[PDB]
Write a protein that binds this ligand. Sequence first.
Ligand SMILES: COc1ccc(NS(=O)(=O)c2cccc(NC(=O)c3cc(F)cc(F)c3)c2)c(F)c1
Ligand SMILES: COc1ccc(NS(=O)(=O)c2cccc(NC(=O)c3cc(F)cc(F)c3)c2)c(F)c1
Lengths: 544, 544
Amino acid sequence: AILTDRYINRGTAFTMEERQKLHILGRLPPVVETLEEQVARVYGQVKKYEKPINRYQHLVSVHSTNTTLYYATILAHLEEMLPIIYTPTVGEACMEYSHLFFRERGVYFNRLYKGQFRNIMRDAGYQKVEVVVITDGSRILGLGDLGSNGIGISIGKCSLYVAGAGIDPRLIVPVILDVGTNNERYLQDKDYLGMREKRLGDEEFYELLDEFMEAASAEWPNAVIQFEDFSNNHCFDIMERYQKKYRCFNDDIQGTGAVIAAGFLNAIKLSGVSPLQQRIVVFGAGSAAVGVANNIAALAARMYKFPVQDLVKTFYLVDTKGLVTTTRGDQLAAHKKLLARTDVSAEDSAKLRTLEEIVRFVKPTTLLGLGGVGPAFTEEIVKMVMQNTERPIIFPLSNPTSKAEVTPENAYKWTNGAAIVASGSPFPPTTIGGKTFKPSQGNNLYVFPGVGLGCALAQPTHIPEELLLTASESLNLLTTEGDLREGRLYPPLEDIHNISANVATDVILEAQRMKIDNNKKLPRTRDELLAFVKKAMWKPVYSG
Amino acid sequence: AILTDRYINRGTAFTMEERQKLHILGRLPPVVETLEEQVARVYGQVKKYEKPINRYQHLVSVHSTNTTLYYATILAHLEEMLPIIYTPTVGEACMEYSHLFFRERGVYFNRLYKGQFRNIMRDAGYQKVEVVVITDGSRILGLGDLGSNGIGISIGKCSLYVAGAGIDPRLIVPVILDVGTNNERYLQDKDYLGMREKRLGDEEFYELLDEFMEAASAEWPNAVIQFEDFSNNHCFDIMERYQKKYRCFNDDIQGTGAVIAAGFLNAIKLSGVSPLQQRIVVFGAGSAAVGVANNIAALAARMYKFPVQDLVKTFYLVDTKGLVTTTRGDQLAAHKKLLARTDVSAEDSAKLRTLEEIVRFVKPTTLLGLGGVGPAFTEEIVKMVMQNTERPIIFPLSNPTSKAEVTPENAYKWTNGAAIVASGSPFPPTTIGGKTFKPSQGNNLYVFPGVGLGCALAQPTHIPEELLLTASESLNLLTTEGDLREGRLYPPLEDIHNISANVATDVILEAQRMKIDNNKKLPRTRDELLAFVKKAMWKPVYSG
Ligand SMILES: COc1ccc(NS(=O)(=O)c2cccc(NC(=O)c3cc(F)cc(F)c3)c2)c(F)c1
Ligand SMILES: COc1ccc(NS(=O)(=O)c2cccc(NC(=O)c3cc(F)cc(F)c3)c2)c(F)c1
């Protein structure tokens, strides 16, 4: 019976004497293993499988039998497991293997349960819930509507809070708000188990998501609510609607920008071109891309007290028409007006349409790739940036690797190793003339876990932009002299527990300064708080 | 919590009103399905996977979440699921994916636990256990020693008692007696969890298996003990040691022969060549092959009261030297002397070495393939049998299909549809000149489940050869006039519950006649007993 409880089961780690005492002698094969030995064994069982999706299926089975062993395996092989346990494998599992999520602790909402949301939460019988991940399966990148099968996205994200910040796996809740699906295959699929209708309109959407926030705030009062993988028609509006009234954030919007800003300011430090001397092409002019630019400006203003207006003038925003300027004779979308050039004539605007001529005119020191239109950063463009700086900063952030603006390999080759590169995705190192270069991956894992752990300990009334900026700065400052010497823009991913504890500490101190913190038991000075935060984290080791 | 109990979990079959009452509204996606709908959905999830081993892995996951749904899926698609849930996929799962068995209810014995066997059984906390499958992983066919990974063979076989005869899945126990392994890969594999030593010698082997039988007889007194997949050096000796003192049998030896005999007597009925007019080449002279011949003789003697001596003279036994005769000038192994020809000269014996000349001399009406040396039944041999009978009986029983003596397709083609064929393995039908022929598969599933259900109800003191013969005859008699008209040698496999109930009834009546039955509550007349046996079977339907 202890064997059948995944939270306390140790499998072959139960000693002979423990097996005799627990009456489980003969329920296990005779070999006794340490946790490290069980991890090496699982890692081999995983690499037996060739397909990401079968590796995932194997790890799901470990998770349902031995939760400690699962999280211990992830933490020993984090960089390699991350693309299997979340993006992009988790989406493929949701889309075509949703049965992998059936036995997990999801909470399912829909219009049929209108007015019962709070009873459904009370009935789940969870104690002091710390983190709730919710999706409607609409997808941030707008591809492959998963409807009800979105529950797997919430399950995978909840697992990254546990692995990344030692949120107790008993105190995380994955939610699907099923407001229907526009997935035509699913609408006609006899085996789709969700609401078989097109996505509700906005008024009914917000009636249900309002009830969910109010029910969660009453029944899970200690929880952080994190919006995952909501489509662009809703994700920005959801934060505007809830950010002040509930303890909530959106990792896709706020996490991404905090991690990219941290990495970019370290690229500036390495580049020899100080923040006010940077000329930054922002290739892509969506709301997300502009939010990342603004996050960069906000962090450089916090860390260096340059006037934010002067930081904004380092940005050269490029949409599908070309360089965004006040003189090019169109009515600009609201988000584009802030970053619009005021220093460019109508006549020059007309000659600044293709990325190549924009780069030749602007003479940038940085290329930020947020475009999602393939390999726009060509050899010619990259060799033009080498004319403006000894250390071109090149960030191909468009997902997946096929949408990327340039490969890190070409960035390094074309610059003879001078390029400073951050990627959305992991890449193998590149060796040029005996010298090795590897891009810095700005993974969202750097920030959301520590925001979750900080907000779980501090119990703030809400999560204002100040806490995200603090988490951005905290992450920047964790890149050591030694990391920076080796060209790293972030502390190492494998150190995620120490990263999360430090992000959490800084978030807590910021909540304490703003007096929005509801937990008065916490220390109020950084050294003592950091020790207290570390002690509070759940660890994937056998404890009893 | 009801959802997390695989025995009572109904998943999406819980109605809306049931979900509200059980407080699980919002723990499931909103679609409500019947069991039949859940089965169709699972069957599609299974056929999504291309590889037998991934289909198995999928079915294992269903089994660990919803036991009723698992057994309902097997019974709806039995013929197609059988090669996935047992031979040959179960062996490949044991050999390379033993982690699939970790979460199942195995009991593990080894020399380290000597003298504790009964405490290990008492600690398992099972109530009125009916069926125990035990293996040591040595393998009947002597290939791929699995050691401790043999537990998966016991697990799969236990599952066939539940599916086949409605043994309650709570009342079956899979056992591995780990007496070491001769698998060199495993002896050197850091991840082998069993006893890391060569197989114990016979004296220590029997010390441990003795303690197991005595402990099982005391702690699981109502159980049938069935030996599965033991190597030829032990399997015959084990039955000789235990058959009278304990309630036990070996499916590989006794099950096989009872099913082959049933099918062969139906082939005789269809062939127009009555039992005393049959001339049977037994291609293969191992103990198993001779036991099958003797099972045939024993059944024809029971059903027809021909003198058994006259039935024995229909057999022409062929070993690696050639036709087994009293005059060929070697000292015959004991098992070969009974079937030795007394009517063949030393001079003819010398000219009867190759199967071709043996067939030309003997002029057989039947070829029994138990040889395990590939496709020995050639076009020439098959067309020679067409000279001796209008309906050649051709049974290629050697496993797997590559060791088989002939394909059913060639048997039918070469005889223009006249051949009466039984196979070890399923084959697709063959169409010749617009007429369709399909071989009869003599699956062991026809007999062991009903022997298990009969011995579970009757609680006989032991399982004498009389009960196996009765089960053989019972199975023969279940092939209806209609089945026989269509060329079927066995009732249909999909009817396995009715088959098992009828086999069980006949086994019980035989135990009652021999006064070895310990359960006095049972009816003693066939019609009333059969109704009572049917009522007692566990059914894979939702009941509460
Ligand atoms: C893919 O799933 C995996 C699960 C566990 C492990 N490793 S392990 O070391 O946890 C282990 C090793 C071998 C056997 C057990 N057995 C059990 O945990 C067990 C549980 C039960 F609920 C009832 C039971 F009888 C026995 C565990 C694994 F590598 C894969
Ligand atoms: C491969 O495994 C399968 C398992 C179940 C089904 N079908 S089903 O109809 O049983 C079903 C359908 C959808 C969801 C649930 N959920 C649960 O059974 C469940 C259990 C728990 F222990 C806790 C929990 F919160 C929920 C079940 C399946 F096709 C595959």
